[PDB]
Symmetry: D2
Subunit: 169 residues, 4 copies
């Protein structure tokens, strides 16, 4: 059967970098891959199919696809759980990267569902913006409104450890 | 801050055994622990626990010098457990939670899913597949009783299987 | 091919307990195992063949042996490296537990050689006898002479973290 | 105390890439680092380093506020590296070492073996097997040049293989 590996953690924790490392491993082994991002390059702080609904993946999966790679999974509809389950049942390995928690420390539900299904969970850490320790597990929003769905980078979000998050809040 | 470690996997994967290992570690270090299970008193694998109905009941048993909180069968607790645990971590208390990730129908257990999202560390445990004997079982399959997803029981009702064996047997 | 897993760390770090957990996994799967200790029970703080030389293992390995489990590997002749390599080549998984360092912080050479060969290395920690933190990586000798080969338990050896070791020395 | 992390595996397993990742982590935290390679200056994967012949030469480049020491290609350093590293750990400096565990003939590299024994954490990396394409290569096989076990080189001389493929090709 296919195995599901979920790579999660706060922003800047190396989730996309790890995901791309896995893509490279499959490519080096001459295994066909399909790479997806929500609505073209997967960029760290490769080319992907940009899709809206998880079900669109099926358009781009071939008989000999061995691995499916999905970035920013927190932005996908939770139906991604059942789509992934079906890929695993068909012998296709799946690798997902995404945020575990919003900047308000609420779960991203799609990520949470995938963590449930995962054969392996890799929790990544970032360097804390405040204290410089390699212990950041949260993201804090420093600009924009309070919205939990709000695309952005270092102008809007910083990685912090739990103590620094509580101090700053 | 406290760290949250979530130990998950199918039945018979050693989740409770691992949880009790960490209890032992804290006890050897003369660190105060609080141990909980959902509503008898014995946390026993295939230690004494406070048997509680609701996550909000944990506060009564958490003293000022509690260093670790240990919770088994977390799939059966109300999802309010998420904010309770977050508060403990903010106060510097380490939390260890053991529970099933998936029902026998491969639906997520909500509370476990939420705690996986808050976790600093996730330990996915495997079991031996009842069918092929490999150490690759990640799922539980229900072999007796009804189709119900909430149904307490052991070997008389559930086996651990790998994905391929689960699909084959279904 | 067989895979080699080495479980190492100071005394009281759970190495035998982990080794026995692996034995149980193979037994539950109805896979034949062969279990060895140096010169009858493997006891944590199962029955084993007590042997002197690593080459004696071959007397007790059968065509359908799937796993070989060796405790206290630090006490075996370094020829255990080549014996293990041959088992792996034959498709037999090998699990070794043993101390990485003496109480003088010198390497146990047999363990070191096996760490080199290992597919997976599990470093176990103990609770520090002095500070109570789960950070003990060393063993300190508190009775007996200075000998590095000296069988014993808690009457002779304690597990300590590096800072506590240096403080106590 | 400082902790020692040893990153090992066959060629092309990402050892240097992982080592440089940890360098980056310390640099982002504004922690002083010292980076070494055996005797040009660039540590480059398949950052600037001090190129040194002997482990005893590291002391010159370690300042009072050095937080991390990073060492690549440790298999080529004298086994005296063991006591040098032990001393750094005793002084509170974290050490990260990357190196091969085994020669192409499957003999242990002595210095790597000693550091594996001192390590707090061992990361075994794999490569893609040149023969079967699976992510299961743990060995290096020499495909050109002589039988020598000390022979600097890359893809023109060495491939990564799994155990079964190594045995088959031999
Ligand atoms: N606070 C930080 N900690 C660690 N690395 C950082 C930090 N800020 C920037 N970086 C850089 O970010 C890289 C990781 O980038 P990447 O793999 O894109 O992370 P990510 O987890 O995908 N982030 P995101 O997509 O925003 O949720 C690191 O290798 C660093 O170069
Ligand atoms: N300092 C300590 N830290 C952790 N556990 C300890 C300590 N002292 C005693 N124990 C107990 O020891 C058990 C681990 O025993 P075991 O699996 O035999 O360890 P080991 O690493 O094999 N020791 P050794 O064979 O002496 O090299 C733990 O589960 C505890 O019950
Ligand atoms: N299929 C199986 N795989 C592994 N262990 C099993 C299996 N069936 C029974 N066991 C026994 O169950 C123990 C694990 O029990 P436990 O820690 O209570 O697991 P969990 O809390 O995950 O159900 C094992 O050590 C073993 O003795
Ligand atoms: N057989 C292989 N397996 C994996 N990666 C390989 C292989 N051959 C070449 N590469 C490339 O080598 C990179 C790893 O290089 P590097 O970090 O310098 O490894 P090491 O220091 O272990 O030799 C991979 O990311 C990949 O780009
Ligand atoms: C798989 C599964 C288990 N259970 C119960 C059976 C056990 O009482 C408990 C799991 O025990 P365990 O994870 O310690 O082995 O959960 C359900 O109620 N529904 C399910 O779908
Ligand atoms: C496998 C092997 C590599 N080497 C050299 C080749 C490379 O120069 C270096 C390993 O590089 P790497 O581990 O960064 O890929 O070691 C030997 O000298 N002897 C050997 O047996
Ligand atoms: C932390 C956080 C990030 N994001 C976005 C910012 C980035 O575009 C992406 C993480 O790479 O997710 C949110 O939309 N909500 C959040 O709460
Ligand atoms: C730490 C240490 C333990 N031992 C012995 C004590 C125990 O009998 C065994 C570890 O379980 O190894 C030594 O012989 N030398 C040492 O340096
Ligand atoms: Mg990203
Ligand atoms: Mg249990
Ligand atoms: Mg032992
Ligand atoms: Mg390299
Ligand atoms: Zn911080
Ligand atoms: Zn099976
Ligand atoms: Zn200590
Ligand atoms: Zn191969």
């Amino acid at each position: 059967s296919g195995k599901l590996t979920v790579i999660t953690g706060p922003m800047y924790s190396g989730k996309t970098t790890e995901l791309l490392s896995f893509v490279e491993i499959y490519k080096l082994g001459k295994k066909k891959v399909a790479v997806f991002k929500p609505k073209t390059m997967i960029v760290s702080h490769v080319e992907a199919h940009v899709i809206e609904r998880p079900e669109e993946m099926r358009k781009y999966i071939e008989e000999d696809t061995r691995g499916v790679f999905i970035d920013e999974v927190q932005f996908f509809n939770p139906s991604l759980f059942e789509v992934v389950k079906d890929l695993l049942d068909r012998g296709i390995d799946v690798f997902c990267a995404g945020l575990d928690l919003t900047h308000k420390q609420n779960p991203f539900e799609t990520t949470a569902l995938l963590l449930s299904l995962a054969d392996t969970v890799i929790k990544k850490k970032a360097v804390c913006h405040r204290c410089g320790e390699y212990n950041a597990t949260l993201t804090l929003k420093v600009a924009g409104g309070e919205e939990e769905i709000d695309v952005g980078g270092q102008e809007k979000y910083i990685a912090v450890c739990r103590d620094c998050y509580n101090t700053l809040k």
